[PDB]
Design a protein around this ligand. Structure first.
Ligand code: ZN
Lengths: 199, 49, 210, 149, 79
RNA sequence: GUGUC
DNA sequence: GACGAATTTGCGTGTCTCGACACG
DNA sequence: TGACACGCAAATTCGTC
């Protein structure tokens, strides 16, 4: 009786894996036949064979969903900082406070190369760079540390050390990753999205 | 032709064509559907097709 | 207390109509927009059922804000069921002075011959209908209706020159959808849609009215 | 004697069954109304339920009541609500691109033979999907030209 | 004249340029590099791209009909 | 028609 | 009081209803 | 053996002579 009740459920899944293929393949070949000519032009616009405007910007950002880092996002700023913090260590460079970190960041950001992307990404990175500075002041007044740079305890300056040389490479790397995260002009978005709901 | 008993080839259906379309390659899609399967040279007229 | 609920349903549709005329571009002050229940009770009595507050008493004359020599009416048929001459009397009632634009807030179901005769004459006078059951909630401020703004022609020309396309290329929208009938826009106008989001920001989209 | 019970005394006739759901939190309590019907414009245009915050499941009902631009949002949440209970992962852009394919015309279309006949414009393409004779004979009768692209 | 297109070299154009160069070199074409002893001109076609010595101009067409000329040496190759 | 994925 | 016009609803019919390989 | 989009058609109501 237990073997019969166990093999009853085994036939429940064996008849289910035989029928899924039919209507699944039917819905797949019905979904591909409608979305197979949707392409992205060179002016960041998706159109069909006629020339009609489907969407002014694919998704809203013009980014390939495949090349993304973090649940929908271009890249994670904390992880890239955690990487660049240890790959370029040089104790010769001293530390700095937050009120100078903000001015250095906004001075190095106002350059001739950085004025090519969306200012939304710039505000998104300004929200993260500002939040890192609030973490530094609480740790600095945590134990008691003057930022002038002369205090005989030497290890208290190694808790969260941010130097101006490694902060430029972080910005350049994230800005360059945001350049490659953009979807290429000419990709077939219709055929790509048609099969994403297939499997 | 169909079958190995007559020394035939393989079939390239639509689901495998969708994989080549999603990538975006047009040279290979035309090479293994028109150049290697059936390449014919026909003639027509301009006055009346 | 049923007439109390009827007066509440009537105040709701009156406030929605006022908000619609305010968003369209007509000039109305705030206290008429933001009127409370007791503030409405001092202008119009509640009891009896539909006595002192007749439907003919509900006939609002709004003035166009940018163009002075322009006035619009909006009124309620006294009758539950609409007829043919019952609309023509109200048409020739406000046709007599200088008026061209009026709105009908229909109470219950509509007569097809009436709407056919309506769509018969539109060289000079345009009359548009609205169901009372339909105008009991704000449509733009509901939950997920993106902010729509009807644009001008001096802007659509530079929009066409921006992307180098034609009006046919622009996505078309219907003329009978509740939003278009709300804003009252037929063929030959582009609407801007602001799609909000708190991930990156808000996006801009353009649509054509068909 | 057979239709007196059939005659309703109050309510919405096509509205069938309603249940109240209790949603709790740390110290918070809400009562949400679940209506099993289609007439959204009628269940929202009442005194009790809040008319601004009320959503439906049928795409056609929200299309005819709210509008076409508001129907493209309820179809994105509908698809995403079906994918999160399965343990699958799709990105928002794949759904947003498909939701704009059946809305740029002006009408909410479906991916069938009749919808594809209305959205696209190619003869031999439409013939290579469903019935060939009908499309070919219609093209021969009309006699239009087709630029193969 | 100002360019309104991204400067990064697409893989779609990279592949087609590589294919065109591979097909042309196999046509007894003058090589733009001193190649090592090695067959399969496809293998050496990437060598010219890595050294930016490919005389090919990419013409990008816009939906309206605008033509944009770009050089393979001017494009940025990233990998 | 049978057999496998 | 009686006749032409337009609306809503029960009922008639056509099309498919994933791929691949091998053998008799 | 499910899917509903097309026509085809009869019961019925507002209207005006
Ligand atoms: Zn000839």
């Amino acid at each position: 009786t237990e073997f019969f009740f166990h093999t009853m459920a085994g036939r429940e899944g064996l008849v289910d894996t035989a029928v899924k293929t039919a209507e699944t393949g039917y819905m797949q070949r019905r979904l591909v036949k409608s979305l197979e000519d949707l392409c992205s032009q060179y002016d960041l616009t998706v159109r069909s064979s006629t020339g009609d405007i489907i969407q002014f910007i694919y998704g809203g950002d013009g980014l390939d969903p495949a090349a993304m880092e973090g649940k929908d996002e271009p890249l994670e700023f904390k992880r890239v900082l955690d990487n660049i913090k240890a790959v370029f260590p040089c104790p010769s460079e001293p530390a700095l406070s937050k009120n100078e970190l903000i001015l250095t960041t906004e001075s190095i950001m106002k350059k001739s190369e950085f004025l090519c992307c969306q200012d939304s990404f710039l505000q998104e990175i300004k929200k993260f760079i500002k939040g890192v500075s609030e973490k530094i002041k609480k740790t600095r007044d945590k134990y008691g540390i003057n930022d002038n740079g002369t205090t005989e305890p030497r290890v208290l300056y190694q808790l969260d050390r941010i130097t101006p040389t490694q902060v430029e490479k972080f910005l350049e790397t994230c800005r360059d990753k945001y350049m490659r995260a953009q979807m290429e002009p000419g990709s077939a978005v219709g055929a790509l999205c048609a099969q994403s709901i297939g499997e | 032709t169909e079958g190995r008993s007559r020394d035939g080839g393989l079939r390239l259906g639509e689901m495998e064509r969708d994989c080549l379309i999603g990538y975006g390659a047009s040279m290979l899609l035309l090479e293994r559907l028109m150049i290697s399967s059936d390449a014919f040279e026909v003639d027509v007229c301009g006055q009346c097709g | 207390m049923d007439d109390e609920e009827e007066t509440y349903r009537l105040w709701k549709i009156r406030k929605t109509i006022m908000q619609l005329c305010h968003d369209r571009g007509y000039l109305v002050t705030q206290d008429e927009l933001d009127q409370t229940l007791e503030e409405f009770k001092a202008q119009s009595g509640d009891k009896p059922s539909e006595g002192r507050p007749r439907r003919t008493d509900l006939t609002v004359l709004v003035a166009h804000n940018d163009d002075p020599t322009d006035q619009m009416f909006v009124f309620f048929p006294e009758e539950p069921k609409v007829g043919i001459k019952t609309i023509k009397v109200y048409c020739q009632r406000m046709q007599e002075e200088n008026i061209t634009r009026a709105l009908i807030v229909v109470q219950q179901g509509m007569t097809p011959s009436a709407k056919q005769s309506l769509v018969d004459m539109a060289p000079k006078y345009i009359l548009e209908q609205f169901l009372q059951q339909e105008l009991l909630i704000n449509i733009t401020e509901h939950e997920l209706v993106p902010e729509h703004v009807v644009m001008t022609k001096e802007e659509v020309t530079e929009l066409l020159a921006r992307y180098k396309l034609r009006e046919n290329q622009l996505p078309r929208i219907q003329a009978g959808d509740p939003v278009a009938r709300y804003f009252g826009i037929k063929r030959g106008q582009v609407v801007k849609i602001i799609r909000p989001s708190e991930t990156a920001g808000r996006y801009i989209t353009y649509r054509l009215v068909q | 004697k057979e239709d007196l019970p059939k005659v309703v005394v109050q309510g919405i006739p096509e509205v069938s069954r309603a249940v109240i759901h209790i949603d709790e939190q740390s110290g918070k309590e809400k009562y949400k109304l679940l209506v099993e019907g289609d007439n959204l414009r009628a269940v929202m245009a009442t005194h009790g339920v809040k008319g601004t915050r009320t959503t439906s499941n049928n795409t056609y009902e929200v299309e005819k009541t709210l509008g076409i631009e508001a129907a493209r949002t309820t179809i994105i949440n509908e698809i995403q609500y079906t994918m999160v209970n399965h343990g699958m992962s799709i990105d928002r852009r794949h759904v947003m691109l498909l939701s704009d394919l059946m809305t740029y015309k002006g009408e909410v279309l479906g991916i069938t033979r009749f919808g594809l006949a209305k959205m696209k414009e190619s003869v031999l393409m439409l013939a290579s999907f469903e019935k060939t004779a009908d499309h070919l004979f219609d093209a021969a009768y009309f006699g239009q030209k087709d630029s193969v692209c | 004249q100002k360019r309104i297109t991204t400067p990064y070299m697409t893989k779609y154009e990279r592949a087609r340029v590589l294919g065109t160069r591979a097909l042309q070199i196999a046509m007894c074409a003058p090589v733009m590099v001193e190649l090592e002893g090695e067959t399969d001109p496809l293998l050496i076609a990437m060598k010219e791209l890595k050294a930016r010595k490919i005389p090919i101009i990419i013409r990008r067409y816009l939906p309206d009909g605008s033509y944009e000329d770009w050089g393979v040496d001017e494009l940025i190759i990233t990998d």
